[PDB]
Specification:
Chain B: Belongs to the class I-like SAM-binding methyltransferase superfamily. rRNA adenine N(6)-methyltransferase family. The structure holds 2 chains of a larger assembly. With 906 residues, chain A is mainly alpha-helical. Helices cover 53% and strands 11% of the residues of chain A. The two termini of chain A are 39 Å apart. The termini of chain B are far apart. The chains are: A mainly alpha (906), B alpha/beta (340). The structure holds guanosine-5'-triphosphate. Chain A binds a DNA duplex (26 and 27 nucleotides) through α6, β5, α13, α23 and α24.
DNA sequence: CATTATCTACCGCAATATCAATACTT
DNA sequence: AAGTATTGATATAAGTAATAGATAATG
């Protein structure tokens, strides 16, 4: 009877936010008119109600004007005014939706968008208008679908969305009113006055105007309060009832909320290919894996939640809670006669203080929001439906509270189902606690010994979390370590450990799954043994080895008396070098690795605050070590990069009849595409964006049009193909492992590389994951990718220059001259493309006579395809057929040998 | 008695970094005669002069020959130009120094502590007669240096703590048209407003006679500049240049608030003033409508306003009780929530 | 040949007003 | 031919002159 009770709440929790908000603060008006005249945050809800009640007549009047203007049908004599002209632009859109719903949508979106976009006390007007328009169109779609189901353009242009958003935002600005108190400096007399709540203004940054909306400090004073949850309600939140399993890409996840399987940000090609794959039916395994991930139950850790609530109510700055502060602390202004360098330093300090203060406020607000959700979901069981991104990795549909969040969100989550520890449950819980404390190179027995060494500390930290030694704070994952300490205290209370029913998920992870895939694909013995694919006696740490190498490099380079080298000679650490290497193998840049290492070492503060200069040399040493360390992965990613270049710099032969004629070179519209081992189609979304000044009521925003067809960003394709391929393989392995575990009946959820389950079923899960990795990687995926590209891009021609003096080039020159007289006009590369295309069309004719005659015809590219040495030999522009490079040689290494490995996932 | 360099020596130089120099001694003599610097400085024999971005050094050599100052200093950072100047002016009383005039720390080191060049402070009533600063900012990519120097005119901090010092500026013609603008002209901007508020300027020379239409007719007929041709500047590829004379004047307003109000008010420079006020802050439109009794000022665009009206509006802005703070006016790109 | 931005992957962010030329309809 | 809307170009602020580290495009 638990499902039916939760079913009613979810239908209530899936109620329209616009209807609830209409009823919510309308109710809050009743107590205000009864209790008395006040300005508490309940009166903030009252102010929102008053804003709605005064804004509704203006929207009604605008609808009346548009309806009365659209009645006539002669556009020349109608709407001579500029304002009345745009009425034909937008009016047929506004009449669809209830004006009250429209008003509440505008108010809620404006409240939600505050302190966003780099504005101190507001949001950029372009974001505000486009977001209001998008919310209105989504509400329109929901209403249309619901009424169509009840009774038994299609895509709104971004220009119309921006126009509607600006109209409504301005019309609310003209209405919103709030009272502020202040003194005048003539007489130092304290006075009161009311002002509009919002004021549209402009700002500058490096010589550029930013149309910004501004929200009054009086409004912010209440929007900071904990009643923000009451004033604004989330739309997507964790579910109590079992999610509907993934079958159709247009129907799944939430019971009443439609979502797509892929998170296609700004491209329709990925949507089209995913829809084609769904219609064909090649992603049933993906459906099964997503259902397994999204079918597990969770509940909030009550004791850890109580501890977090007490720490937050204290108000002091905890490990990750920023704390509570009310006003900024700005240093005294320097004298106006001081040097411009001093003035610039003071302005930089002011900017830094404002940045830190805003970031701390945002952290506090997010933590308060998270705790409010946790309190609203205390005790009950919660479900996480899972979506997928284009590159293939899984994410939930609850952005606010999820296990992919920070340490607090993870520690506040446990499995609703409990399973007995059995013979190995206590051992694996102790392993998990050892994992949470940053020690991993030690074997399982040593981990158990480390956990056994600190029973008294565990008992203290569990009997009294605060007001004690607080050993859980000095852990890399504090809240999860606290939950683990709680459960070990409970089991040590019992005389028989193997009878305790537990709820704590155990962390099992594969260190650098990308490196594992490199070693597996290349068949490299050295990489496999370094990454523990080969069975060994103890886990081996690639991060530790490369960190020792970087220590050697810095010892060599310290002879220059460098302060950074002297300090970090004995301070190079596993964490910094690991954060550098994990992304580096993925293809990070020098500046990216510098950013990561500086970010990780900045809290240590061993060097100066401006450690970028030092981290430059540190990254240089790291790259110098990695170049010698890794070769097979480097070769594989180079083959991927060469393939990316060839695919990007290619033109199909079916583009047109004559040419695009847009410049000498037709635009490039070729993106790298292939198929995951589970049948999902991966498409790189990278493209160019064309942003045009779109006029609106408030101002002329600077937005693009994602529906327009644009060229492909070659640099982004090159940078994205390798990591996208690697992580698609990783997520496919994760999906297969999840599907098999769900078939076996385990409770399975995962965050990318790491896999979560109870301590009793960890061995079965480990066996399942080894088997699934073997099954997925038994095939030569690099070769299969080569044939996939060959079949997908067989009729493609490159573009390149050629020597004027090449003997074959003069033949191409004559064929150009020959083509000119045959076509009757000047010869072009586009004419060559058309001639090649029609020749392939001739081969498509089933008539054998036309085929031989078609084979008799000679085309410029047709000369190249007969040739086999012009590309190697390589002015004038020439057309080269798309010849992808040969795959790098594959070393000899048996895949199945890792089945006996112990520290593959640990 | 310093050796004036020639066109053949100028052509030998390789890198100019966009800087263009006038090289005609006759035109320089005419310019100096028009300036008549001896009128302002009754005793230029003891005068000390500093040069920013000297370059060829023709102007420095001609100035020293004509006036015989006491101590003359040059600050050049370009490498080839530095070797050229050092090689040419060896064994001469004229001084050459290697320092970059872009960095404020260079000025602080030169005047404050090391004290190679020690100017004397004068009163603010009259132009300092013992300090002359001549600079060349003809480079196309360094107008920000000129605007920062005008802000230093306003703030009385960088080099103007010594008082009112005259500035002779070789600087591009486009920035000259923007800077020397008058109310109502299409080239009116914050350059012109700052110039009007903090100094008085007179055009002294121009490179192309075609560009004189952009300026004001009364102003050009008053100044009577010395028109020359593009031949007399060695690098001919660049845009035409202009020479201006900057004289600091006394001002009575609060620089920070005036700066804020002008910058925010004049963004919509072609909007009637009865509409542009609401962007100053919340309720600014109502407040300024209440406090502005004149109905002739409420229909003039900010491009048509002058420094007096801008100072008046600054005064009303300060008398505003509910004024937004001017320090919290920026966007922080470092901060971004960017939640997943 | 110097310049010129450009920098792992994702997971709901990076400009605007004004003025001149041109072509389009009337 | 004379308006008139469209399309394109240009200035704004005023130390990212806050990297050779490494490099693929540019004109
Ligand atoms: O703590 C982070 C984080 O909460 C938030 N944040 C910033 N960028 C992102 C993002 O791309 N995706 C998500 N989910 N969250 C984001 O802002 C805070 C930034 O503070 P930090 O100084 O700790 O992070 P920083 O950007 O400096 O380093 P990094 O995010 O590149 O690693």
């Amino acid at each position: 009877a638990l499902n039916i009770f939760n079913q009613d709440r979810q239908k209530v929790l899936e109620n329209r936010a616009t209807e609830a908000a209409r009823e919510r603060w309308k109710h809050d008006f009743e107590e205000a008119k009864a209790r008395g005249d006040i300005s508490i945050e309940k009166n903030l809800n009252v102010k929102l109600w008053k804003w709605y009640n005064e804004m509704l007549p203006l929207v009604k009047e605008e609808i009346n004007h548009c309806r009365s203007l659209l009645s006539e049908k002669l556009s020349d004599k109608k709407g001579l005014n500029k304002v009345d002209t745009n009425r034909l632009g937008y009016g047929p859109y506004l009449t669809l939706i209830d004006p009250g719903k429209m008003c509440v949508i505008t108010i809620l979106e404006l409240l939600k968008l505050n302190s966003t976009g780099g504005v101190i006390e507001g949001m950029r007007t372009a974001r505000a208008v486009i977001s209001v328009g998008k919310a209105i169109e989504m509400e329109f779609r929901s209403e249309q679908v619901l009424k169509s189901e009840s009774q038994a353009k299609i895509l709104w242009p971004q220009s119309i969305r921006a126009r509607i958003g600006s109209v409504l935002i301005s019309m609310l600005i003209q209405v919103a009113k709030v009272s502020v108190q202040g003194v005048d400096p003539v007489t130092k007399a304290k006075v009161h006055g009311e002002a509009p709540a919002f004021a549209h203004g402009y700002q500058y940054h490096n010589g550029s105007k930013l149309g910004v909306l501004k929200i009054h400090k009086t409004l912010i004073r209440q929007l900071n309060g904990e009643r923000l949850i009451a004033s604004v309600q989330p739309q997507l939140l964790p579910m109590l009832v079992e999610p509907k399993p993934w079958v159709n890409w247009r129907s799944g996840g939430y019971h009443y909320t439609q979502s797509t399987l892929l998170r296609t940000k700004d491209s329709p090609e990925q949507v089209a290919y995913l829809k084609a794959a769904s219609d064909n039916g090649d992603i049933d395994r993906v459906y099964d894996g997503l259902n397994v991930l999204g079918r597990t139950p969770w509940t909030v850790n009550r004791k850890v939640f109580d501890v977090v609530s007490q720490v937050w109510n204290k108000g002091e700055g905890f490990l990750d809670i920023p704390g509570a502060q009310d006003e900024m602390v700005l240093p005294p202004a320097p004298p106006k006669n001081s040097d411009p360098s001093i003035l610039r330093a003071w302005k930089l300090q002011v900017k830094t203080i404002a940045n830190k203060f805003s970031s701390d406020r945002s952290n506090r607000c997010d933590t308060n929001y998270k705790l409010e959700i946790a309190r609203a979901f205390l005790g009950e069981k919660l479900y996480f439906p899972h979506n997928l991104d284009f590159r293939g990795r899984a994410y939930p549909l609850s952005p606010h509270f999820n296990h992919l969040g920070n340490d607090m969100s993870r520690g506040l989550l446990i499995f609703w189902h409990g399973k007995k520890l059995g013979p190995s449950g206590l051992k694996w819980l102790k392993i998990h606690l050892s994992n949470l404390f940053g020690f991993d190179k030690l074997p399982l027995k040593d981990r158990v010994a480390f956990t056994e060494s600190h029973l008294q500390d565990i008992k203290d930290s569990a009997e009294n979390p605060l007001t004690g030694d607080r050993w859980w704070t000095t852990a890399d994952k504090p809240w999860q370590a606290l939950a683990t300490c709680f459960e070990l205290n409970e089991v040590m209370k019992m005389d028989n450990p193997e009878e305790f029913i537990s709820h704590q998920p155990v962390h099992q992870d594969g260190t650098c799954n990308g490196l594992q895939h490199y070693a597996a694909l290349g068949g490299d013995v050295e990489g496999a043994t370094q990454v523990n694919l080969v069975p060994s006696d103890k886990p081996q740490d690639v991060y530790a080895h490369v960190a020792r190498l970087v220590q050697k490099r810095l010892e060599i380079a310290a002879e220059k008396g460098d302060e950074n080298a002297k300090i970090l000679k004995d301070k190079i650490t596993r964490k910094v070098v690991k954060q550098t290497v994990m992304t580096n193998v993925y293809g990070v840049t020098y500046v990216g690795a510098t950013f990561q290492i500086a970010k990780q070492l900045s809290p240590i503060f061993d060097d100066r605050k401006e450690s970028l200069d030092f981290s430059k040399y540190l990254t240089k040493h790291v790259f110098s070590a990695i170049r010698e360390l890794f070769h097979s992965a480097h070769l594989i990613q180079d083959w991927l990069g060469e393939s990316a270049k060839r695919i990007s710099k290619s033109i199909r032969l079916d583009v047109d009849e004559k040419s695009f004629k847009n410049g000498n070179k037709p635009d490039f519209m070729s993106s790298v595409i292939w198929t995951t081992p589970l049948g999902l189609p991966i498409v790189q979304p990278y493209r160019e964006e064309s942003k045009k000044q779109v006029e609106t009521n408030l101002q002329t925003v600077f937005i693009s049009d994602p529906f327009a067809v644009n060229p492909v960003n070659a640099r982004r394709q090159k940078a994205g193909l390798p990591p996208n391929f690697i992580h698609s393989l990783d997520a496919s392995h994760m999906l297969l492992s999840a599907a098999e575990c769900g078939k076996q009946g385990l409770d399975f959820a995962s965050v990318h590389d790491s896999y979560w389950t109870h301590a009793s079923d960890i061995d079965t899960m480990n066996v399942v994951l080894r088997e699934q990795f073997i099954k997925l990687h038994e095939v030569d995926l690099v070769l299969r990718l080569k044939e996939e590209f060959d079949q997908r891009y067989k009729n493609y021609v490159k573009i390149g220059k050629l020597k004027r003096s090449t003997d074959l080039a003069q033949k191409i020159i004559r064929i150009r001259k020959d083509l000119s007289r045959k076509l009757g006009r000047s010869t072009t590369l586009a004419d060559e493309i058309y001639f090649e295309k029609k020749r392939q069309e001739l081969l498509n004719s089933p008539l054998i006579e036309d085929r031989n005659v078609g084979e008799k015809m000679v085309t410029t590219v047709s000369l190249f395809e007969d040739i086999t040495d012009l590309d190697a030999l390589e002015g004038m522009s020439v057309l080269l057929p798309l010849r992808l490079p040969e795959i790098p040689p594959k070393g000899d290494f048996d895949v199945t040998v890792l089945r006996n490995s112990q520290y593959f996932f640990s | 008695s310093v050796p004036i360099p020639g066109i053949k020596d100028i052509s030998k130089l390789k890198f100019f970094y966009g800087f263009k120099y006038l090289w005609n001694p006759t035109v320089y003599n005419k310019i100096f005669d028009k300036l008549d610097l001896t009128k302002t400085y009754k005793h230029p024999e003891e005068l000390k002069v500093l040069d920013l971005y000297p370059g060829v050094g023709i102007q420095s050599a001609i100035f020293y020959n004509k006036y015989c100052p006491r101590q003359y200093s040059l600050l050049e950072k370009r490498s080839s130009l530095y070797k050229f100047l050092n090689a040419k002016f060896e064994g001469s009383p004229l001084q050459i120094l290697k320092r970059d005039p872009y960095d404020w720390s260079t000025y602080s080191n030169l005047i404050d502590e090391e004290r190679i060049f020690v100017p004397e402070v004068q009163s603010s009533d009259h132009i300092n007669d013992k300090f002359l600063t001549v600079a060349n900012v003809t480079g196309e990519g360094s107008e920000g240096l000129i605007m920062q120097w005008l802000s230093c005119i306003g703030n009385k901090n960088w080099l103007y703590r010594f008082g009112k010092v005259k500035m002779l500026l070789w600087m591009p013609s486009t920035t000259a048209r923007k800077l020397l603008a008058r109310p109502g002209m299409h080239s009116r901007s914050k350059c012109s407003v700052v110039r009007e508020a903090f100094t008085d300027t007179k055009l002294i020379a121009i490179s192309d006679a075609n560009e004189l239409k952009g300026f004001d007719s009364q102003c050009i007929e008053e100044w009577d500049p010395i028109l020359f041709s593009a031949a007399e500047i060695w690098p001919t590829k660049g845009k035409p240049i202009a020479l201006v004379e900057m004289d600091p004047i006394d001002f009575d307003f609060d620089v920070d608030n005036w700066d804020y109000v002008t910058r925010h008010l004049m963004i919509l420079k072609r909007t009637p003033l009865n509409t542009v006020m609401d962007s100053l802050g919340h309720g600014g439109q109502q407040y300024f409508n209440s406090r502005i009794t004149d109905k002739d000022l409420l229909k003039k665009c900010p491009i048509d306003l002058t420094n007096d009206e801008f100072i008046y509006l600054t005064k009303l802005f300060m008398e505003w009780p509910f004024k937004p703070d001017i320090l919290m006016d920026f966007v922080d790109m470092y901060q971004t929530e960017h939640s997943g």
